[PDB]
Amino acid sequence: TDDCGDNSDEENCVPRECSESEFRCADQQCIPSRWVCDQENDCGDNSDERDCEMKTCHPEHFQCTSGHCV
Amino acid sequence: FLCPAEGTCIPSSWVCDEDKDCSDGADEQQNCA
Amino acid sequence: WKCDGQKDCSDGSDEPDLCPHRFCRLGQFQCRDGNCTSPQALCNARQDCADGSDEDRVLCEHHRCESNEWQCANKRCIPQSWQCDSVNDCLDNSDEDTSHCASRTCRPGQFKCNNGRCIPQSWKCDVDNDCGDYSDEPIDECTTAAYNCDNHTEFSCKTNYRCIPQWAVCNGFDDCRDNSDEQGCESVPCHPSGDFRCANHHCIPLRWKCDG
């Protein structure tokens, strides 16, 4: 986000490393891993909401026939 | 002489004459060894 | 300069009545058959005119050149530093002749190698093998007190006895042959007003900003 007004902070910028419990969208953005396959477009391009039946999810969830988790 | 790399059957007069007749040259390196 | 458009002499003998047609432009030698060539073509032993008049005996008999050049017995002039370098700058190897390259002396201010090269006096004891015979680098003598760097202006290399001027420090080029002068340029501060700091820690003159 811009915090200067002339956007000089967000320039010459390399995307940060995602930490242990984050997931990295195709556009190099980091989101909480809980948000993958939760039925919401959290990356903005649905990069989080795919291959969902090819993985399991945290034991407190129920997994849909389509592999999404609630 | 059938050299394995092609499956062709060249005349036996071409064996051990220092000419690489077929691709693998089995008439030189495989027979005259 | 004789027989052209402009009268150069005060007397006017520059342009006599018996003057041939001028076929060439100004400041250019004219061949006897009307061809044109540059003045440097005169008496360089490579015939350039159609008649070879540029190498005529009468013309080249008493040819002389500038103080910064040396003349071979062939009567072709080459820069003074192109003697005794194992390169055939003259045609007849008069520059590289062994009797000459033994007997010759350097012009004032230059050091002589056993090879027969002359070099700048500064080139003596600077690690670089300038003479080819390492005559400019006597290790026993180069490491004595007589060749200490001028501490007002020169920076001393770490791993050898080379001294380089301070303005060569972290300029982005290996000047010490061990990269000593490019170490830790981050600590080097630019002059407060005259320099512009780069993305790297080099300081360049401000006049070089946005020059293209």
């Binding site: 195709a26 477009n41 903005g44 391009d45 649905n46 990069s47 795919r50 291959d51 039946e53 090819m54 | 220092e18 000419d19 690489k20 007749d21 | 047609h21 076929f23 432009r25 058959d33 009307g34």
Partner: protein, 602 residues
């Protein structure tokens, strides 16, 4: 500068500094007798007369009546048959400098005999005809390290006693100097014995093949190609209908006749098409199937879609109906390849960093390569070799090869590469692979094992894709939006084919010979789900997220899905209009002069 006015030389570009001046001499001449006088008062050196250079800006230098009478000499200036003495450098320079192509014809070119040796000369290596006295003087006079061949001293010898194999020369003091007869080279040991050359090995010797023989070679066109000779030389022409180009843009895919030069519409109204590939005439119905990728747009996933293509002549008479394979979760499907033999489709996804395989109907998805891919692009497959090849155009570019089953992955080229965006294989020249760069913008080819790297085309204006067919290599300059062509071995020069759009993302050549149809499927129906290929055989595999049944290697615990059939296509030919009834089956409103259910009867 004013000093350059009225001084004989034209110093204005238009010569206007000379074209209006007083007379120079007291008889009205402008120039000395030594110079020529152009009619625009320009002075010019005499020997510049009609040398081909437009010297007088007026053109007075190049009048034919003057040109004919100028003295000339063949090595420096020669008469062209239009009475113009062309400059000798301009013979065979690549340009018709005179208007009949005399200064380009081969007869004054080449060599009549190439200065052949007599008894007074010496052959040296292979024709360096200097005088004979080089014979075994123990000096490398020829320059080529072949001046001394044999050369074993001793006066009382002649090799007619069978000391050397063939074609000696008499040594004055050693009996034999024995250079090899043409088509042979001397062996290291026993140099008197000559080894036959292998002329099939040398790159680009013939359009398709070769047959090494005793001191000679013979080359031929393989099955399906006919021998033809161009003005240059050999061409193996493909039989059947002429090859087509398929041009995918972000909105449509366009067909092109490379023989007729007319476009065809094909698929339209689509959006975000990236790469295509086809499968030639599976059902023998006379219609191939074209597969194409679709990118993710906005917040929506892409697709892989397939549709029929008429092999015959059709346009605006057959509506094109595309279908979706149903591969969800697709984002940047940027490499696509169709395996015609095993009936599998391979693709890469640039977002997901992986290579996937599935059937031609989208069933049984399986991941093949999942690790150490940065941006996988431009996959290709060779069932007749059992290898499939992909490029990576990420931060450390590489070209790799692996078995179709997913094993024996290895790196082919990693040295000196930048954005290898496109990839193609020559099935006739040793399965040699081509790829196109975008940073160094070269096109390069290499053997399939990764040996003999060669830079085939230089300064290719940032190529983006390739196809190789019928001895020529086609590519797309992406920015300029032009399709370009060369002889596939890098010889001769480039040539513009046609210009489309900056939206052009690929060129794919469309012909039955592109992908050899007579390759036999190794699978023997013992494998459920996928039956992948490998060098010399097959391999059974399970879909993603399922394993084999324990103690079995041909059966998996996953279920099976029925094949997904094609909708019936519009098969109308010769401009007959397709039609849909209450049954929604495609039928024909056939044109005049033709009969049949569609238009099949003349």
């Amino acid at each position: 500068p004013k000093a350059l006015a009225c001084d004989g030389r034209a110093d204005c570009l238009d010569a206007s500094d000379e074209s209006a001046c007083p007379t120079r001499f007291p008889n009205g001449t402008y120039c000395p007798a030594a110079m020529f006088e152009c009619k625009n008062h320009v002075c010019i050196q005499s020997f510049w007369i009609c040398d081909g250079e437009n010297d007088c800006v007026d053109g007075s230098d190049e009048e034919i009546h003057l040109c004919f009478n100028i003295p000339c000499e063949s090595p420096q200036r020669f008469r062209c048959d239009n009475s113009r003495c062309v400059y000798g450098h301009q013979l065979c320079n690549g340009v018709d400098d005179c208007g009949d192509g005399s200064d380009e014809k081969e007869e004054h070119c080449r060599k009549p005999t190439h200065k052949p040796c007599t008894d007074t000369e010496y052959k040296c290596s292979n024709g360096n005809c200097i005088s004979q006295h080089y014979v075994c003087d123990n000096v490398n006079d020829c320059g080529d390290l072949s001046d001394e061949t044999g050369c074993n001293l001793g006066d009382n010898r002649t090799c007619a006693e069978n000391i050397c194999e063939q074609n000696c020369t008499q040594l004055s003091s050693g009996g034999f100097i024995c250079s090899c007869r043409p088509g042979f080279k001397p062996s290291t040991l026993d140099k008197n014995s000559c080894q036959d050359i292998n002329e099939c090995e040398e790159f680009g010797i013939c359009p398709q093949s070769c047959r090494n023989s005793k001191g000679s070679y013979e080359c031929f066109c393989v099955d399906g190609f006919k021998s033809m000779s161009t003005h240059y030389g050999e061409r193996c022409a493909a039989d059947g209908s002429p090859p087509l180009l398929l041009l995918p843009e972000n909105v449509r895919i366009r067909k092109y006749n490379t023989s007729s030069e007319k476009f065809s519409e094909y698929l339209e109204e689509e959006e975000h098409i990236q790469t295509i590939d086809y499968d030639w005439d599976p059902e023998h119905i006379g219609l191939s199937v074209v597969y194409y990728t679709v990118l993710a747009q906005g917040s929506q996933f892409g697709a892989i879609k397939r549709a029929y293509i008429p092999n015959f002549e059709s346009g605006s008479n057959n509506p094109i109906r595309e279908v979706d394979l149903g591969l969800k979760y697709l984002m940047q499907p940027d490499g696509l390849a169709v395996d015609w033999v095993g009936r599998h489709i391979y693709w890469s996804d640039a977002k997901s960093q992986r290579i996937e395989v599935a059937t031609l109907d989208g069933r049984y998805r399986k991941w093949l390569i999942t690790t150490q891919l940065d941006q996988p692009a431009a996959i290709a497959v060779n069932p007749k070799l059992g290898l499939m090849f992909w490029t990576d155009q990420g931060k450390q570019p590489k070209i790799e090869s692996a078995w179709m089953n997913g094993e024996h992955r290895s790196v082919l080229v990693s040295e000196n590469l930048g954005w290898p965006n496109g990839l193609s294989i020559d099935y006739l020249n040793d399965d040699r692979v081509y790829w196109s760069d975008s940073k160094e913008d070269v096109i390069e080819a290499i053997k399939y094992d990764g040996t003999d790297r060669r830079l085939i085309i230089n300064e290719a204006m940032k190529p983006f894709s390739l196809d190789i067919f019928e001895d020529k290599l086609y590519w797309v300059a992406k920015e300029k939006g032009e399709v370009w062509r060369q002889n596939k071995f890098g010889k001769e020069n480039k040539e513009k084919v046609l210009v489309v759009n900056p939206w052009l993302t690929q060129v794919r050549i469309f012909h039955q010979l592109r992908y050899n149809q007579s390759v036999s499927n190794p699978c023997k129906q013992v494998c459920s789900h996928l039956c992948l290929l490998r060098p010399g055989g097959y391999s059974c595999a399970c879909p993603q997220g399922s394993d084999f049944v324990t103690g079995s290697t041909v059966q998996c615990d996953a279920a099976s899905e029925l094949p997904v059939t094609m909708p019936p296509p519009c098969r109308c030919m010769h401009g007959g209009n397709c039609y849909f009834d209450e049954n929604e089956l495609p039928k024909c409103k056939c044109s005049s002069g033709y009969s049949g259910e569609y238009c099949e009867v003349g």
